[PDB]
Each structure stands twice: as structure tokens, then as C-alpha cells.
Design a protein around this ligand. Structure first.
Ligand SMILES: [Ca+2]
Ligand SMILES: [Ca+2]
Ligand SMILES: [Ca+2]
Ligand SMILES: [Ca+2]
Length: 200
């Protein structure tokens, strides 16, 4: 008869996993142990109680305790996957044991900075003429954006001090102009977008 509980090799498991990992990719391996012999020591791993998301993104091998990728991890959609692995042997009285598991989703530079523009209408030098707002959905460096007017044109950007906002203003006056704004991450590889604009 079934004398022992299964026992995880660790009460709790931490893990890092970069978003957009390929399907099939190994995430982590869990192991439990039964001092017993026979079926009374034959462990199945299962997480039927795990959140829909976890079950949607991850596959847990019933026999080995290998968690591998089966869906699209988006750090931008969900940044941490926390759940619990159940291990029970095959006694007819099947003694169980439970280990909790945390996967922190690592950021990838998968998001090009976005730049939204609205106008304000001799004209004075240093005069604000548009509102430019810039935002990158990524994290840290991958969202450290650099924004500049492409060309040689008598306009430049100036920050509304410390979603980043900027005044597109005047560098000298006169008395009509197309103006291209350029945005670039400080992540590797960096991504980039532009937005044209006709002064009004
Ligand atoms: Ca047992
Ligand atoms: Ca993403
Ligand atoms: Ca990202
Ligand atoms: Ca980015």
C-alpha cells in the first residue's frame, strides 16, 4: 500500500522566458520523487487547475515534467505566468503533492515606436506648430526612443519637460513645407517609424 507522498525537488520554481519563443521550446523541467516502489511511486505531472492563459501558452509533459512552449508568448500582453504543478503517483489511494511555478516573460524589441501628430495652426521664431507624442510598447532600452526631424528644415522638436510629448516649433521665421518626423528605439536590433506632416 501507498506509504509516501510524492515530493518535488524544490518547493517552488522561478524561470525566465523571452517572449515570441518558438513552439516546442523548453521552458523548465519539474521533478518529484516517491520513496515508494511500483505504481505507488510512478508520478504523473498535471496542471488542469492552471489559468486558461498558462494552459493556452504552455504544454506540461505528463511523464517527464517538461514544460515547453505551445502558444504565442507576448510580454506586452502578459509579463508573468504564475501557476502550480500537481504531481500524484498511481496508488488506488493516489497521494499527491504540489509545486508552484513563476515564469517572468522577458521583453523582445518586437514593437516599433509610434508617433502621433496634431497641428496648432512673419511668424515668430521658436513658435510651436505641432504636438508630437511618442510611445513604444516594449520595456527599458527597447522603449528608449530617439525622435528627430529628418531633412534640413527650419523646424525642430523640444520636449514638454519630463508617452513622451514634444513641441514641433520654429528655428527662424518667414511669410509651405512637408516635414518628416523619425523615431528609433535604443534596443538591438532597433526598430523605427516615421510620420510626414504639412504645416497649417
Ligand atoms: Ca507514493
Ligand atoms: Ca510583444
Ligand atoms: Ca516586447
Ligand atoms: Ca521597441
Amino acid at each position: 500500500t501507498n506509504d509516501n507522498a510524492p515530493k518535488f525537488e524544490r518547493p517552488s520554481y522561478e524561470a525566465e522566458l523571452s517572449e515570441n519563443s518558438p513552439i516546442g521550446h523548453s521552458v523548465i523541467q519539474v521533478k518529484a520523487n516517491d520513496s515508494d516502489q511500483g505504481a505507488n511511486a510512478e508520478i504523473e505531472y498535471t496542471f488542469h487547475q492552471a489559468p486558461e492563459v498558462v494552459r493556452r501558452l504552455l504544454r506540461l509533459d505528463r511523464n517527464t515534467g517538461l514544460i515547453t512552449v505551445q502558444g504565442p508568448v507576448d510580454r506586452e500582453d502578459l509579463s508573468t505566468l504564475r501557476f502550480s504543478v500537481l504531481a500524484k503517483d498511481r496508488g488506488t489511494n493516489p497521494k499527491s503533492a504540489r509545486a508552484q511555478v513563476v515564469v517572468t516573460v522577458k521583453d523582445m524589441n518586437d514593437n516599433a515606436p509610434t508617433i502621433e501628430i496634431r497641428g496648432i495652426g512673419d511668424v515668430a521664431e521658436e513658435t510651436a506648430v505641432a504636438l508630437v507624442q511618442v510611445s513604444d510598447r516594449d520595456e527599458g532600452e527597447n522603449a528608449a526612443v530617439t525622435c528627430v526631424v529628418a531633412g534640413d528644415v527650419p523646424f525642430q522638436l523640444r520636449q514638454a519637460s519630463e508617452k513622451k510629448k514634444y513641441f514641433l516649433q520654429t528655428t527662424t521665421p518667414l511669410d509651405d513645407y512637408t516635414i518628416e518626423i523619425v523615431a528609433v528605439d535604443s534596443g538591438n536590433p532597433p526598430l523605427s517609424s516615421t510620420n510626414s506632416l504639412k504645416v497649417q
